[PDB]
Amino acid sequence: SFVEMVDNLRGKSGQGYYVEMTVGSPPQTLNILVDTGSSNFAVGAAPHPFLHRYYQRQLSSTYRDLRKGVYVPYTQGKWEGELGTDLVSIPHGPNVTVRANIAAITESDKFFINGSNWEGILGLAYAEIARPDDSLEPFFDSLVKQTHVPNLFSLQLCGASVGGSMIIGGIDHSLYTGSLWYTPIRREWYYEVIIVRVEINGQDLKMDCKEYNYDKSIVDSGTTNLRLPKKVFEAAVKSIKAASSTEKFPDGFWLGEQLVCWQAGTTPWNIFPVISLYLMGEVTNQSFRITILPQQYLRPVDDCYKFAISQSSTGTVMGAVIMEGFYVVFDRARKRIGFAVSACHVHDEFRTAAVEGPFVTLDMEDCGYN
Numbered sequence: 001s002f003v004e005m006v007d008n009l010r011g012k013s014g015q016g017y018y019v020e021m022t023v024g025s026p027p028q029t030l031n032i033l034v035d036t037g038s039s040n041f042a043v044g045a046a047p048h049p050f051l052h053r054y055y056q057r058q059l060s061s062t063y064r065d066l067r068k069g070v071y072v073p074y075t076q077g078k079w080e081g082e083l084g085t086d087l088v089s090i091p092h093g094p095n096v097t098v099r100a101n102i103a104a105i106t107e108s109d110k111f112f113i114n115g116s117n118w119e120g121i122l123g124l125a126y127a128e129i130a131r132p133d134d135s136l137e138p139f140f141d142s143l144v145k146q147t148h149v150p151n152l153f154s155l156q157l158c159g160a161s162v163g164g165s166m167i168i169g170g171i172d173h174s175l176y177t178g179s180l181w182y183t184p185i186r187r188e189w190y191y192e193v194i195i196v197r198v199e200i201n202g203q204d205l206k207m208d209c210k211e212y213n214y215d216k217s218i219v220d221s222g223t224t225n226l227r228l229p230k231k232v233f234e235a236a237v238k239s240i241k242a243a244s245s246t247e248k249f250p251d252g253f254w255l256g257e258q259l260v261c262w263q264a265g266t267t268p269w270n271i272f273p274v275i276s277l278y279l280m281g282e283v284t285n286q287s288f289r290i291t292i293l294p295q296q297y298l299r300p301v302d303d304c305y306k307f308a309i310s311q312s313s314t315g316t317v318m319g320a321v322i323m324e325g326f327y328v329v330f331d332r333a334r335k336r337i338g339f340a341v342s343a344c345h346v347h348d349e350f351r352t353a354a355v356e357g358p359f360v361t362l363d364m365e366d367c368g369y370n
């Protein structure tokens with residue numbers, strides 16, 4: 001069953017997690033980044049300095065041209081290309097073949113990463129944010145429509161090269177401990193959720209909770225950092241600075257530009273606070289929390305680190321540094337996202353990442369931004 005899909009992801013820290021796929025007939029093998037923050041399936045289809053291989057449409061007998069161009073901008077990076085369809089498989093996934101939409105990337109800017117080892121992107125979010133428009137059926141919708149694969153998938157992203165699992169069509173219980181806690185998908189475009197409270201080392205940030213979700217909060221496996229709205233970012237950095245005031249850092253560290261180092265084995269983990277994000281729950285006035293350790297938001301790059309919390313102008317993004325602590329279930333069928341402590345969690349001496357509940361939280365709907 002699902003055991004065949006365990007450990008089917010690889011990657012390099014800060015460079016994304018990818019799964020192996022094949023496109024075309026005969027099968028062309030490519031590594032494809034798993035991106036829950038977008039909805040287009042696209043692959044390099046022309047030579048590029050950072051590509052070791054790419055998709056060759058002329059060598060595939062099942063390729064069909066859709067005679068339509070396409071462009072996709074991301075927070076950082078963008079590409080343009082030609083739309084078409086072809087047959088697609090996932091060797092370490094379910095045993096099926098689907099005809100899916102594919103954008104053949106012909107030109108790009110700051111999209112491909114040198115040394116990343118992936119040549120394409122699998123947008124796993126909903127058609128609502130697909131380009132050129134929502135009539136271009138995303139890959140997972142095609143998968144579910146053409147096969148018996150159930151309408152959900154789950155991601156276990158493991159940090160300190162790295163690996164993980166994408167379980168397509170279900171949940172593998174060997175991959176997490178404790179209970180799964182679910183938060184509603186507020187609207188099916190991004191995987192949008194609602195954050196209802198934030199605490200740092202047990203102290204409430206005490207902001208209007210709308211600020212936490214201004215102008216949206218999303219879960220994105222294709223973003224490295226925890227990215228926070230301007231006002232929230234400032235409050236969070238202020239609190240984290242105060243907790244670590246014992247030591248002194250370059251001011252470019254807090255902007256993610258400069259790294260800090262310590263002698264191997266002497267990283268003062270203790271002076272950096274835990275961060276708790278409370279998410280809206282499944283019953284009235286009920287929430288739960290996920291707690292993040294400094295080992296997650298200080299990304300290893302003697303031991304040197306970069307600050308992996310950064311400022312956003314497009315809402316909160318819960319990226320890899322959040323997901324790495326957890327097993328995350330994208331339960332599209334029941335419009336909810338589940339969190340549990342991952343089997344591959346990192347080890348702090350006196351502290352542990354957690355998913356805990358129930359909590360009572362009043363007026364949660366008012367935390368959503370309009």
Ligand SMILES: CCCCNC(=O)[C@H](C)C[C@H](O)[C@H](CC(C)C)NC(=O)[C@H](CCSC)NC(=O)CCC(C)C
Nearest residue numbers: 014015016037038074075076077129220222223224225
């Ligand atoms: C068309 C409408 C949908 C657009 N969606 C997005 O822009 C989502 C929010 C972001 C998307 O996941 C892209 C993926 C990347 C591979 C280009 N990520 C980024 O732009 C982010 C920008 C971070 S700003 C410090 N890139 C990274 O974190 C670097 C690591 C990645 C190579 C894994």
